[PDB]
Amino acid sequence: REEEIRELYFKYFDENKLPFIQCNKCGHKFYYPRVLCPKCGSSDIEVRFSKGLGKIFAMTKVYRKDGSYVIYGIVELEEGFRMYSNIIEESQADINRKVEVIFKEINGKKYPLFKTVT
Amino acid sequence: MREEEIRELYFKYFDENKLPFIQCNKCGHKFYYPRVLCPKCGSSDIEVRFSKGLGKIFAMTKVYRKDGSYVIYGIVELEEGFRMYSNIIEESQADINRKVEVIFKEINGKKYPLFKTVT
Ligand SMILES: [Zn+2]
Ligand SMILES: [Zn+2]
């Protein structure tokens, strides 16, 4: 079930892989792990892997005490699904700026973030 | 608000036997899972609303329980026009498009929403 899928995502992150789910019934692609397709409700789903290339769909800045900020955002992957992620600003972050996935260790476990690219 | 803060308020409303959801003021999208940006249009201009808790079964599956039985897990479409995942209690037999209403159950000192079929 669901709890297992979540666990699996952690395994994939550890391998520097960005998983997502594709529904074999209706074709819908979605990141947040569920055992039924959120679009059509099918249980006939499979884990696929994204190349990790995308763009900033939406973003907001969340400031820190030193004046710096973390970027909360939605990234649209080229495979045609979106996910929430923090975004590391190397080049200037704007709407539709290109980003790529990068896996960072957070309290001992790797998670996907996105970094702006040139 | 921060996402964490919205989630905390969701817990509060569960305790009050209320089913919250979010509506986007920019694009009108309604969604249950708490986010600071609208998943459809990306806007931060969102508001928490409350559902009447009436819905229907959009999809469902039977999940094995290790006492040798099953439970129903599915997607419920609330009348307000958003969907959420939930366990579903069978007061009457569950099937697609059967009406349900929200109920609240305790898990480790926190109430959570689930649904039951209606008679
Ligand atoms: Zn589907
Ligand atoms: Zn919106």
Residue numbers in the entry:
A (entry chain B): 2 to 119
B (entry chain A): 1 to 119
Q: What did the authors write?
A:
The S. solfataricus protein Sso2509 is a translation recovery factor (Trf) that interacts with aIF2 and is responsible for the release of aIF2 from bound mRNAs, thereby enabling translation re‐initiation. It is a member of the domain of unknown function 35 (DUF35) protein family and is conserved in Sulfolobales as well as in other archaea. aIF2 has a second function: It protects leaderless mRNAs against degradation by binding to their 5′‐ends.
Trf is composed of an N‐terminal rubredoxin‐like domain containing a bound zinc ion and a C‐terminal oligosaccharide/oligonucleotide binding fold domain. The Trf structure reveals putative mRNA binding sites in both domains. Surprisingly, the Trf protein is structurally but not sequentially very similar to proteins linked to acyl‐CoA utilization—for example, the Sso2064 protein from S. solfataricus—as well as to scaffold proteins found in the acetoacetyl‐CoA thiolase/high‐mobility group‐CoA synthase complex of the archaeon Methanothermococcus thermolithotrophicus and in a steroid side‐chain‐cleaving aldolase complex from the bacterium Thermomonospora curvata. This suggests that members of the DUF35 protein family are able to act as scaffolding and binding proteins in a wide variety of biological processes.
